[PDB]
């Protein structure tokens, strides 16, 4: 299928409580494979998937050095944004960055990303062309002008179309047992009376990977989008994900409702009903 590689980074300042904490994680699809936390006893990028340890200690040291250098750039950038936004040195602020690439089933680049946010709001993003920028405001326009002068987009384009794509293909092969296996959802429908005139039907999907799934309820073959309560897909802690969708139904009308489940791991889609 299609795949992604992403690196996520968060720096959070804490004036009067030391230097900003820096946490970065890497993912291939919904699998965490590396982590670094500046508050660890001996900060290093640590593996979180068995297929990355085989890369060797030179790989781990190069990654750890990049993590330490990004923590330092982020600390400098947090100081710069206090100036650009005319903010005091008293409050806690947040810097987030994500970058990475998406590839198709054939491993060809579908698109690249590089984007930053300050205090939870867009700051500056590399456009899908990998050649121009979208700055959210006049502070981010200062960074845009600096990055245009230094031809930063060209450097990012080279990385995103080159190493990002190649190393994602490499990890997909080395971790094929897990990264290229879709685990279908285990499903069931539960029934819970609410009053003597209504009951809840809840459609469950458990144990699936990747997280992408479509769970819907239909009544007489019509989608019940407005009336369906749909919880966010949630991690189980063993690589898999869970989700449920519920509808309030009039007593005696249960047979008219069908739950529909679409997921990559299934031989093909499921149509479920409350059984007893």
């Amino acid at each position: 299928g299609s795949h992604s590689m992403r690196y996520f980074h968060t720096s959070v300042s804490r004036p009067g409580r030391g230097e900003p904490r820096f946490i970065t994680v890497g993912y291939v699809d919904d699998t965490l494979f590396v982590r670094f936390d500046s508050d660890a006893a001996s900060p290093r990028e640590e593996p979180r998937a068995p297929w990355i340890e085989q890369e060797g200690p030179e790989y781990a040291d190069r990654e750890t050095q990049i993590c330490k250098a990004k923590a330092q750039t982020d600390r400098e950038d947090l100081r710069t944004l206090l100036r650009y936004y005319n903010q005091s040195e008293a409050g806690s602020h947040t810097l987030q960055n994500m970058y990475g690439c998406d590839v198709g089933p054939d491993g060809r680049l579908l698109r690249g990303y590089h984007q930053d946010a300050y205090d939870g709001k867009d700051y500056i993003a590399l456009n899908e062309d990998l050649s121009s920028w979208t700055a959210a405001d006049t502070a981010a326009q200062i960074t845009q002008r600096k990055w245009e002068a230094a031809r930063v987009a060209e450097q990012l384009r080279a990385y995103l179309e080159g190493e990002c794509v190649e190393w994602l293909r490499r990890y997909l092969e080395n971790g094929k047992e897990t990264l290229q296996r879709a685990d279908p959802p285990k499903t069931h429908v539960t029934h819970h009376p609410i009053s003597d005139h209504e009951a809840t039907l809840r459609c469950w999907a458990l144990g699936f990977y990747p997280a992408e799934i479509t769970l819907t309820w239909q009544r007489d073959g019509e989608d019940q989008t407005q009336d369906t309560e749909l919880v966010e897909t949630r991690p189980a802690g063993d690589r898999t994900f869970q989700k449920w969708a519920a509808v309030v139904v009039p007593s005696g009308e249960e047979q008219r409702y069908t739950c529909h489940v679409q997921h990559e791991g299934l031989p093909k889609p499921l149509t479920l009903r409350w059984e007893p």
Binding site: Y7, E76, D77, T80, Y84, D116, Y123, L156, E163
Partner: peptide, 9 residues
């Protein structure tokens, strides 16, 4: 593999 490039705001 992370990008080794360093850019400042």
């Amino acid at each position: 593999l992370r990008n080794q490039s360093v850019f400042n705001f």
